[PDB]
Amino acid sequence: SVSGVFSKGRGIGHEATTSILRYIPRARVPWQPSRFGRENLTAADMARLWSRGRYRDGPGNYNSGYCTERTHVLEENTVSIIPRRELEKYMPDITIGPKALVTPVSLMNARNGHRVTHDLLHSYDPHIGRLGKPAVVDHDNITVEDPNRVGLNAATLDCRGRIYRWLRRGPFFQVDNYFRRSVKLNRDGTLPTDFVHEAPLMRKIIRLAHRGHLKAACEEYRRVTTVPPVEVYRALTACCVPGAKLADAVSIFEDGDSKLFYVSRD
Amino acid sequence: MRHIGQDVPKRHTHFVLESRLMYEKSFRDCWLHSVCRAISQLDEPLSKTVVGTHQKMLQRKVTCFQYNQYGLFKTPYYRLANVDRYHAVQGVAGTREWVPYVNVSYWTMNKMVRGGNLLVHRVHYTGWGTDSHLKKGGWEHRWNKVLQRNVLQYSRI
Amino acid sequence: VGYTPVNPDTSPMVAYSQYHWHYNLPQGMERPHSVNRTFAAPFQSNHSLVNKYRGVWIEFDMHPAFSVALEPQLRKLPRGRTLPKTPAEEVIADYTALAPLVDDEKTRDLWLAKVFQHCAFQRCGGAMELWERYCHQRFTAEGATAKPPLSLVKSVLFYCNKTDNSGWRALFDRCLKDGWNYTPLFDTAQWSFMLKSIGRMGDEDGVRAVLEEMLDVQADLDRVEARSVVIALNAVTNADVYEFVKKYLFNFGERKVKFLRTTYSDLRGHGAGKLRIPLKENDNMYYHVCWHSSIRSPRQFSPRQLYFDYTPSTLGSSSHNPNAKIDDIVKDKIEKWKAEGLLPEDYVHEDRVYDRS
Amino acid sequence: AKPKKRPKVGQGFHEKAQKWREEYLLDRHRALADSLRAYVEFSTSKRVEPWDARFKPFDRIEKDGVYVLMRYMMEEKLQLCNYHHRPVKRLFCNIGLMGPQITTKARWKPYRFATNPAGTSKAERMYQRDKTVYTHGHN
Amino acid sequence: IAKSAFGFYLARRGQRKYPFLRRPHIKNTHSMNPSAPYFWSFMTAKSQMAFLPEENYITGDWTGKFFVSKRQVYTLQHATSGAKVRVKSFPSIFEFNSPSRWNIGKEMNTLTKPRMDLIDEQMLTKKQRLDYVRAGLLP
RNA sequence: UAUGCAAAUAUAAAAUUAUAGUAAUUAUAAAUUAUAUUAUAUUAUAUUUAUUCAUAUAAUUAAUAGGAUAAUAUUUGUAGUUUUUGAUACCAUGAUAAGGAUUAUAAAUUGAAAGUGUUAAUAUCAUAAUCAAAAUUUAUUAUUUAUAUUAAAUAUGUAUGUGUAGAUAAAAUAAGAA
Ligand SMILES: O=c1ccn([C@@H]2O[C@H](COP(=O)(O)OP(=O)(O)OP(=O)(O)O)[C@@H](O)[C@H]2O)c(=O)[nH]1
């Protein structure tokens, strides 16, 4: 007479460490020696449990657009799902894709640390979406299905502690996590510069600076996501000499050295 | 799960956490949704830069983006149910079964005041309390005085 | 009352009870507290220092005239936190073609140190011929008396560690206290690079010598990176050096040994791709590191696991055991009496009861 | 314990409800067309005079007083406005020569009394209007 | 007696008075109220310039919806395409098997009758049937 | 409804019952318990107003993890599946409400403790929970009455019928009542 919610589970560490680590006893929690979390669930069970997290607009809900069942029984009356092709005839198709959900970094602060519009709150710290792998948040692969268990939902297993941790976030929590996990200093000692995507912005700033458009140069500098090189700072500082803008030169130097890895220590 | 080794005495207490999460989602989406709504249905020209087709096409595109925003917090605050954090009892704001300052139901408030769990002072049941604004005009007067203290006090720049 | 607890700070009844301060009694501070002054903890950060250089510094400092003269050549050599991507053979050719021209031993040594640093960054193993061409004849050979500059020796050590060269011992032995005595000036980054290189190279005595020298010279084991220590301790197989590692592992702190165990486990498991060269299987060292971490860490209490197989005494649980041996107690008493001598020594005792099994 | 499924709706009720809803929708279409027709015809048709002939401004004989002004100045537009209370009041406001006398002193028949046709001569006419027309009390 | 999960959890507390336009469970029983003159200003968006709601469009890579939302406003393509249109309603669903051009531009909740006049004679009990007969709803 | 036929409590006694054999004593007393103002006298009660009362939906609750201007930890990116079982769709101890009839003028308040769904020991298939646009049959609820009538979250199409049966609600406090 044995009953179980889940009939199969998988371990976390593979067969290279546990065979040797089993000889060392582990002090499990005294009042619940056997634990079974979301990271310990099988693929199908975890997927079906994560689909049910969202109240609506999710795969778990029978009518949310992402369901997969052929038919649904409603009040002892069977009903057939209208396929996407038949819906398209009278429902106009508007779809941008994963790009629509994500929002720019400059708007992250206005959106209160969130760059994703997904109904599951994505946190950049590697502890809330903590599956077996560390929580890494993708940007151009954000989807409703969300194969990586990186979002936060309030219905899955072992979620209360994660909810409490999310609610106890400090000021600039997500912003600081994003900064420290995206702009980390290189191991070889070189500053995290020479980014291929960010390169044209530096040249534009340098051109505006050498053209004496310091206001527009700074207005484009505030759009920089990564850490700009020392060339930007030297040009911006040299722009202030003709105008005697010591206040702005000092502000530029402070923003360069005090915060961004002392790039302006030149 | 499925009431196997439940720790909290009440299952419904988790709905309080769910309500907090929906409030956080509202905090995220309150600016983007409002901006999209404002841009979409503004008939007058925005400025000299955008007029006519350059404005109507932009409005259509921003409305399409807002519709494509999956998970946007559309629901208003007054339609979100209020559930006590102590005993998971539901109360609707505006009635007497919910208090605004403590965010607990009428039953929880009565229990806490009858015991010692909340420092409150007793006033006459058929009076206006002791507040000067309540004696002066009542609920609406104190509401307006809160507004005046918050915003109208400042000569905004 | 109830399952939900009562917070005493918010509940006024607790705050106004006889075990706290009533509101009628004067409100004033009682027994002012000084915790941060009596015993102030050092600042230990869970996150590593973000602004750390995270590399070996060469202390490049030459005469300004020579520096500006060699500026066209030095642009290709690495600067402070700036690494040009010039090919290493180009700078090697420039050095081998221009070094005889400039007449300054210190300047030549600094230039060669920069060349070694650049070729180490590029992992170009062909530069040892430069050392044999210039330094080997006078700095370390048949009892060489010269005193090499600290910058040059540090750069050479960094290069040999990066290229996993086998010639590092001939220089380290000179850098011991009886020779040049440059060990105390080595950075923790230098020590970590040495340990990682030796662990990859699989030298049994090199790791022991380096660890003993670090302990002697007071190198900061805690600030030495965990991965380098793990790689260095993975390569020990001989019994003597293994015993040395066992007795030396107590020098590290509790947090350091815990994270050493964590890094070892993750690296030999999931983080096998983190290393460019996969780590060899050393189950003895893995088990000993785990066991040592368990010893050092505080021990929790798991009563069910500890006493799962616990069985009470025969006399204690006789009433609750249907088939238990009671004549064993009489046999033990008889044996005790015979040992005492009160009973005859080695007297034949027959079974007092039937055997029910 | 051990819950069991209990039917709530009748076995054949669903299809019957569906067809009843369809028939109700068709009947609503018919009634909507009829109500639109009746509302347009009521708006176009001439209604009774909305001013009380028993009060100070509208008391003089038809050959004197404000009636001369109405007959010789604004008579043409009254037929075009079909004697509805809102347009006649607005025209009285715009014509001037009366000032605030149309509100401070004048009075008008109630909302349901001013919607009677041109010739009624009976009080109970307002209850003779069609009931199946969903024109919201607009004949 | 309505049968739902929230019926046990919550309590009606008699005929309690709620704040204006703030009842907890909205039940728009007046959606199908007909009004010809106010046809475009009843249970519909106030401004003609407003776009159709998000519920009228498909946003993501959907696989299919069993029924469309009530606020989805009927358009020409709904009838022209000849596809399948369903709206969730008591007891189960209402399907638009009679596509008409007279309901273009109106919301499906306005088109569908919430409080159906039809009464099931099957699930009704003896006492409940007696009560309905006494009220006159049943013979 | 006394004329006959008819000794009969006003007591010389030996624990109850019983034919003077049946069972194991038998009776009795006191205190207390909700039915009865009296007619100057610790209060004049007696007037005004009101009554077509309705709403609830689409299932997963059991961890801690710190970042710039800090003398250095990649702890960048912290990775050991699986032996338990109740507030859940019954039941699973206790606890707050409504309900005016005699301590009164006076430097004073006209709302009660006798208990009202949610709360702290009994277990033994229980995933019933709002994040919108939704389904009157249910005792416990003051709605706008005939000059001008639908613009912003979507917000009531029904019942004109001599102020009209029965039954019933409220007030003697800045009000006006003897
Ligand atoms: O502490 C750490 C963490 C991570 N890594 C990562 O190791 C990668 C290379 O893998 P290895 O670290 O095994 O190579 P290596 O010995 O040549 O490395 P260096 O001493 O030259 O750094 C590098 O690209 C780096 O990101 C470290 O080197 N050290």
Short mmCIF file of C-alpha atoms (C1' of nucleotides) in Angstrom, two decimals, chain C residues 1-3 43-44 46-49 51-52 54 222-223 225-226 255-256 259 262 270 274, chain F residues 65-80 83-84 87 119-121:
data_model
loop_
_atom_site.label_atom_id
_atom_site.label_comp_id
_atom_site.label_asym_id
_atom_site.label_seq_id
_atom_site.Cartn_x
_atom_site.Cartn_y
_atom_site.Cartn_z
CA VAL C 1 -1.98 30.95 21.10
CA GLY C 2 -1.99 28.79 17.97
CA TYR C 3 0.39 27.49 15.35
CA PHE C 43 36.35 42.08 6.24
CA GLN C 44 35.90 38.74 4.48
CA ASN C 46 31.84 36.14 -0.16
CA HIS C 47 32.36 37.63 -3.62
CA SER C 48 35.91 37.98 -4.88
CA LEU C 49 37.38 41.45 -5.27
CA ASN C 51 38.67 45.28 -9.17
CA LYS C 52 41.52 42.83 -8.51
CA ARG C 54 43.97 38.92 -11.24
CA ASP C 222 43.46 31.56 1.79
CA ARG C 223 44.04 34.06 -1.02
CA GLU C 225 42.98 30.31 -5.64
CA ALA C 226 41.22 27.05 -4.85
CA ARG C 255 36.04 27.99 4.56
CA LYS C 256 39.08 27.39 2.36
CA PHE C 259 35.53 25.41 -1.00
CA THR C 262 33.49 22.00 -3.53
CA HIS C 270 30.38 18.76 -14.04
CA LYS C 274 36.20 24.27 -17.30
"C1'" A F 65 23.68 31.65 -0.39
"C1'" G F 66 26.72 38.79 0.81
"C1'" G F 67 29.56 42.54 -5.69
"C1'" A F 68 32.54 49.88 -7.09
"C1'" U F 69 35.71 53.98 -4.14
"C1'" A F 70 37.38 47.61 1.69
"C1'" A F 71 45.50 44.83 1.64
"C1'" U F 72 43.75 40.28 -3.27
"C1'" A F 73 39.43 33.12 -1.95
"C1'" U F 74 36.83 32.07 -10.00
"C1'" U F 75 33.22 30.88 -3.31
"C1'" U F 76 33.48 33.51 -12.54
"C1'" G F 77 29.12 29.46 -12.63
"C1'" U F 78 28.80 27.17 -4.36
"C1'" A F 79 25.24 20.68 -8.33
"C1'" G F 80 25.49 14.00 -2.76
"C1'" U F 83 10.84 5.43 4.05
"C1'" U F 84 6.83 8.51 4.72
"C1'" A F 87 -7.13 21.53 8.68
"C1'" U F 119 -8.10 30.40 15.73
"C1'" A F 120 -4.34 25.73 19.91
"C1'" A F 121 -4.05 17.66 20.81
#
